[PDB]
Design a protein around this ligand. Sequence first.
Ligand SMILES: [Mg+2]
Ligand SMILES: [Mg+2]
Ligand SMILES: [Mg+2]
Ligand SMILES: [Mg+2]
Ligand SMILES: [Mg+2]
Ligand SMILES: [Mg+2]
Ligand SMILES: [Mg+2]
Ligand SMILES: [Mg+2]
Ligand SMILES: [Mg+2]
Ligand SMILES: [Mg+2]
Ligand SMILES: [Mg+2]
Ligand SMILES: [Mg+2]
Ligand SMILES: [Mg+2]
Ligand SMILES: [Mg+2]
Ligand SMILES: [Mg+2]
Ligand SMILES: [Mg+2]
Ligand SMILES: [Mg+2]
Ligand SMILES: [Mg+2]
Ligand SMILES: [Mg+2]
Ligand SMILES: [Mg+2]
Ligand SMILES: [Mg+2]
Ligand SMILES: [Mg+2]
Ligand SMILES: [Mg+2]
Ligand SMILES: [Mg+2]
Ligand SMILES: [Mg+2]
Ligand SMILES: [Mg+2]
Ligand SMILES: [Mg+2]
Ligand SMILES: [Mg+2]
Ligand SMILES: [Mg+2]
Ligand SMILES: [Mg+2]
Ligand SMILES: [Mg+2]
Ligand SMILES: [Mg+2]
Ligand SMILES: [Mg+2]
Ligand SMILES: [Mg+2]
Ligand SMILES: [Mg+2]
Ligand SMILES: [Mg+2]
Ligand SMILES: [Mg+2]
Ligand SMILES: [Mg+2]
Ligand SMILES: [Mg+2]
Ligand SMILES: [Mg+2]
Ligand SMILES: [Mg+2]
Ligand SMILES: [Mg+2]
Ligand SMILES: [Mg+2]
Ligand SMILES: [Mg+2]
Ligand SMILES: [Mg+2]
Ligand SMILES: [Mg+2]
Ligand SMILES: [Mg+2]
Ligand SMILES: [Mg+2]
Ligand SMILES: [Mg+2]
Ligand SMILES: [Mg+2]
Ligand SMILES: [Mg+2]
Ligand SMILES: [Mg+2]
Ligand SMILES: [Mg+2]
Ligand SMILES: [Mg+2]
Ligand SMILES: [Mg+2]
Ligand SMILES: [Mg+2]
Lengths: 85, 200, 113
Amino acid sequence: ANIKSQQKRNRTNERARLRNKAVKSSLRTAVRAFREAAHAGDKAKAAELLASTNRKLDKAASKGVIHKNQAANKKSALAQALNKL
Amino acid sequence: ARYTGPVTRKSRRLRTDLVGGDQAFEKRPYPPGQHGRARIKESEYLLQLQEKQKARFTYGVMEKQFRRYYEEAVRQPGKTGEELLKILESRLDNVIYRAGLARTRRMARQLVSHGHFNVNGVHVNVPSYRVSQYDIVDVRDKSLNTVPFQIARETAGERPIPSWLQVVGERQRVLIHQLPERAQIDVPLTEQLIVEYYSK
Amino acid sequence: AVKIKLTRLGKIRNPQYRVAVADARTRRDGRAIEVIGRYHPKEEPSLIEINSERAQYWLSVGAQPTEPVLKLLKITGDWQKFKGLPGAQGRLKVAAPKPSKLEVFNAALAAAD
RNA sequence: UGGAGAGUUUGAUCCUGGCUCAGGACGAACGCUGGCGGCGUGCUUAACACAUGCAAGUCGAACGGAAAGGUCUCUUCGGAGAUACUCGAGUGGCGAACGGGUGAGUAACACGUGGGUGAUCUGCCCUGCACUUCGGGAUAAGCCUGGGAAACUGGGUCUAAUACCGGAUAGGACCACGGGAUGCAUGUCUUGUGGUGGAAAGCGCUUUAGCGGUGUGGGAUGAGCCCGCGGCCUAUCAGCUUGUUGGUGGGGUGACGGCCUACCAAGGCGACGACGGGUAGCCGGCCUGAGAGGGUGUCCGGCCACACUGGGACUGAGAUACGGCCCAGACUCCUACGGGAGGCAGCAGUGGGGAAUAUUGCACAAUGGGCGCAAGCCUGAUGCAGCGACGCCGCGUGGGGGAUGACGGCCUUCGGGUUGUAAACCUCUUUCACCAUCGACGAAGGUCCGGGUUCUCUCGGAUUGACGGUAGGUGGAGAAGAAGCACCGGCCAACUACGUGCCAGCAGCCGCGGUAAUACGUAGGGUGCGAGCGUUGUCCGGAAUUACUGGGCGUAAAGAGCUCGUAGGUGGUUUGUCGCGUUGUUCGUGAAAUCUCACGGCUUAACUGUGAGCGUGCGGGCGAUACGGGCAGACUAGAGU
Ligand SMILES: [Mg+2]
Ligand SMILES: [Mg+2]
Ligand SMILES: [Mg+2]
Ligand SMILES: [Mg+2]
Ligand SMILES: [Mg+2]
Ligand SMILES: [Mg+2]
Ligand SMILES: [Mg+2]
Ligand SMILES: [Mg+2]
Ligand SMILES: [Mg+2]
Ligand SMILES: [Mg+2]
Ligand SMILES: [Mg+2]
Ligand SMILES: [Mg+2]
Ligand SMILES: [Mg+2]
Ligand SMILES: [Mg+2]
Ligand SMILES: [Mg+2]
Ligand SMILES: [Mg+2]
Ligand SMILES: [Mg+2]
Ligand SMILES: [Mg+2]
Ligand SMILES: [Mg+2]
Ligand SMILES: [Mg+2]
Ligand SMILES: [Mg+2]
Ligand SMILES: [Mg+2]
Ligand SMILES: [Mg+2]
Ligand SMILES: [Mg+2]
Ligand SMILES: [Mg+2]
Ligand SMILES: [Mg+2]
Ligand SMILES: [Mg+2]
Ligand SMILES: [Mg+2]
Ligand SMILES: [Mg+2]
Ligand SMILES: [Mg+2]
Ligand SMILES: [Mg+2]
Ligand SMILES: [Mg+2]
Ligand SMILES: [Mg+2]
Ligand SMILES: [Mg+2]
Ligand SMILES: [Mg+2]
Ligand SMILES: [Mg+2]
Ligand SMILES: [Mg+2]
Ligand SMILES: [Mg+2]
Ligand SMILES: [Mg+2]
Ligand SMILES: [Mg+2]
Ligand SMILES: [Mg+2]
Ligand SMILES: [Mg+2]
Ligand SMILES: [Mg+2]
Ligand SMILES: [Mg+2]
Ligand SMILES: [Mg+2]
Ligand SMILES: [Mg+2]
Ligand SMILES: [Mg+2]
Ligand SMILES: [Mg+2]
Ligand SMILES: [Mg+2]
Ligand SMILES: [Mg+2]
Ligand SMILES: [Mg+2]
Ligand SMILES: [Mg+2]
Ligand SMILES: [Mg+2]
Ligand SMILES: [Mg+2]
Ligand SMILES: [Mg+2]
Ligand SMILES: [Mg+2]
């Protein structure tokens, strides 16, 4: 890069990329554990995995990583996935 | 630009004495040059063209400037020959001629061009300045006690003054009453062949 | 941010201006949201007009004026009647007028006789 | 409120019908010539390749620090003291997505205009309401070392924060059941119970220095997405389509949706031109025209697309990320051959292409923007200047007398005629240039400074203008310093002489030239224009020669060899009704500029300010029902039996 502040901002783009990626990668595994627990038909674990997964989607939305409507659309699809079970 | 040439030559070709009083004209009223005494073909285009030339060399107006005067005259309500001769009669060098301050048209043009006048207390030096209704036409205090401005003090009688403007006593100043309509316009020319010239 | 700013639209040496409500992400002579007055800094006081009832709308909704427009609102009393400052009356001043076209013309006919 | 024609087919005529011309226009170019000013405007071709300098930073009132400066400073006699204003590098915040450029791609919801969004997002800004609570682990810098020719990079220690991380409590997240209003089907809005949940950060202070933080209600603004309608050529392109068209369940996004996926259905589109081919950024507008139309998209203003070529994501409120990232490709450069670097379609400039398009200018004084509590710093945006008659507009180069129709030139019927009041001479005035002098407006503000406590307010001070010692004023001298270009057979204003002899040449068309050429060349005279005048190219006009306004087809070009019939277009008399067409009115919208009109300001004009039209349309509401159409009947004249 040429401008002095674009060298600076190239360094802070990567640190924000590693921060956002580690948060988004853990949200995939939180959903994936719930999809397996809801495929066991338990409703014992899947009641309390649903409470901890929906809590993680809220905390990602408060850290600016996902959008608040993305947290809403994913919590509503996991909660209704338990009502069928 | 100006013309800056002989003045009787373009009164002989147009067959009409354009300046006031000429003994060189009326010894030869026929057109100048070596084929002057001919009996010439009078085209319809020639009657429209030479009528437009009678106004350009009366008022001292170039062709691009005279055409812009036609652009608004055809575009104002009323007529077209009325409003073209009105806005030619409102130019400052023509106003000075009608008031009697100059003998001819060309000396009326320098006295405006050399800045011997004011209008509303404002020093002007443009000869195609168009005066409006209620415009005072004053004169510079430096230009008083000058030869061409005091040689026209005693000659205030031999030419008539039109009705639309007015001259007063030793404080020389010219007051415009209204814009001149038709009847107080001096007529060496008709006003319809100019209008028919620009339709070609 | 919504700004109340000036808009240069005169000749080369004659900067006429319009008091316009625009966006900050916008060039000078672009689309304004609304024109709420004008400003000619070439007369001898100046020529200042603000709409002053649409100015009271745009200030009451959050439009931040620029620093020449903020001076103009203090002269017209609009910034004072918005913030609650006591100078809410207009302290603007027009030029001392000229006698009209007819009045000078008759006073030359009165002086010549 | 606004419309002109002429030439040319014939021995002559009328008609038909082509061709050519006169006018306007330009981002122009070339030829001849060239005084000044005001104000516009300038790579149309190679989205070709680019040397050098600049075009985006800011905050110490976020934080650790202390390389530079200024200090109280030890006193070294060139070594000191973070305690300290101040500040290079660094972390952190905000900005960098705006502004500026270009027009390659694009025939498309790209643009224009009008709607929808009960299908959505929106940093900073404004306001209502809540809150601002406990803790923790690092690390850049620094310091010490390793690799590398470089560009850069490794490791060990070390230190902060408004950096980061984890809890407490906080409804506009989520699930289920409720009422209550609402309609336009999915529903939306408002409230209730129960069960799950998710924030924050401090820093400064002369002693009213003051700035910030987070969650939620509502605005404002910017934006996304869908739809009606409108603006090219081509059928010597006629079958296109398989995530294709629809459904269901999941996924996905800010949001609807085949946007993606699985499964099921077998559709969708097309002669009202699908699918192809060619070309093109679209528009406000500009040019022309009496209008209707036709041509065009240059300055300026709007939206879109791109940023060496192609592809991709990251960060963020927001990304075609020009002056960011990563991969691939072409090209240029560096290398110790292991590897690295670069992207003017920013401003200025260079090369090249071309008929052809400018300075490696000045300033942040004004206006707009970024950051900052603020002073300020940044700004090739912008304001201005330079260069080019490139355009438009304006003004000069003299004026008043003056016959002795002077000299000369040209013509001559040798008498004269003409250039020509034109010179000469006498005389008047100096706009501009020139010299001298004064000297701005843009600045009811920018900074400091007393009162004016605050905010504000000015008595009033200080200095602050790139343009610029410019414009403008005043003085000085003298007609003094300043005119050319085309054309003259007809259209079409303006005619003779000599030279030449189908030669040399001219010419837009008909044509002129072969020994008396108003058409070739020069001369005199003349006409049209004038700091310009011609020529070429291009567009419209004339052209009623694509004809809606506004044409034709017996013989001039033009009725299919004839019929049947599909789509389509058109339809007798009458009752009732609907109100789609049509028509009246009103509201919303049709930006600004440009254009028309009227006033104002630049000494006038161009130019520019304001007001009103215009914006022919489109949407919403409410009237009318004659005509057209729809719907529900009647009729017998057309048609058929
Ligand atoms: Mg920074
Ligand atoms: Mg993993
Ligand atoms: Mg979902
Ligand atoms: Mg003919
Ligand atoms: Mg024949
Ligand atoms: Mg013939
Ligand atoms: Mg030239
Ligand atoms: Mg030359
Ligand atoms: Mg210029
Ligand atoms: Mg180009
Ligand atoms: Mg620093
Ligand atoms: Mg800040
Ligand atoms: Mg950009
Ligand atoms: Mg620590
Ligand atoms: Mg916490
Ligand atoms: Mg909680
Ligand atoms: Mg499938
Ligand atoms: Mg779904
Ligand atoms: Mg589906
Ligand atoms: Mg193209
Ligand atoms: Mg016509
Ligand atoms: Mg353009
Ligand atoms: Mg351009
Ligand atoms: Mg290039
Ligand atoms: Mg993001
Ligand atoms: Mg950038
Ligand atoms: Mg660049
Ligand atoms: Mg350039
Ligand atoms: Mg060349
Ligand atoms: Mg500035
Ligand atoms: Mg500023
Ligand atoms: Mg310029
Ligand atoms: Mg010039
Ligand atoms: Mg002088
Ligand atoms: Mg003739
Ligand atoms: Mg001869
Ligand atoms: Mg000749
Ligand atoms: Mg001129
Ligand atoms: Mg031509
Ligand atoms: Mg033509
Ligand atoms: Mg036509
Ligand atoms: Mg015909
Ligand atoms: Mg027929
Ligand atoms: Mg025949
Ligand atoms: Mg025939
Ligand atoms: Mg037949
Ligand atoms: Mg046949
Ligand atoms: Mg039919
Ligand atoms: Mg009928
Ligand atoms: Mg029908
Ligand atoms: Mg308009
Ligand atoms: Mg005017
Ligand atoms: Mg005026
Ligand atoms: Mg205007
Ligand atoms: Mg209506
Ligand atoms: Mg019958």
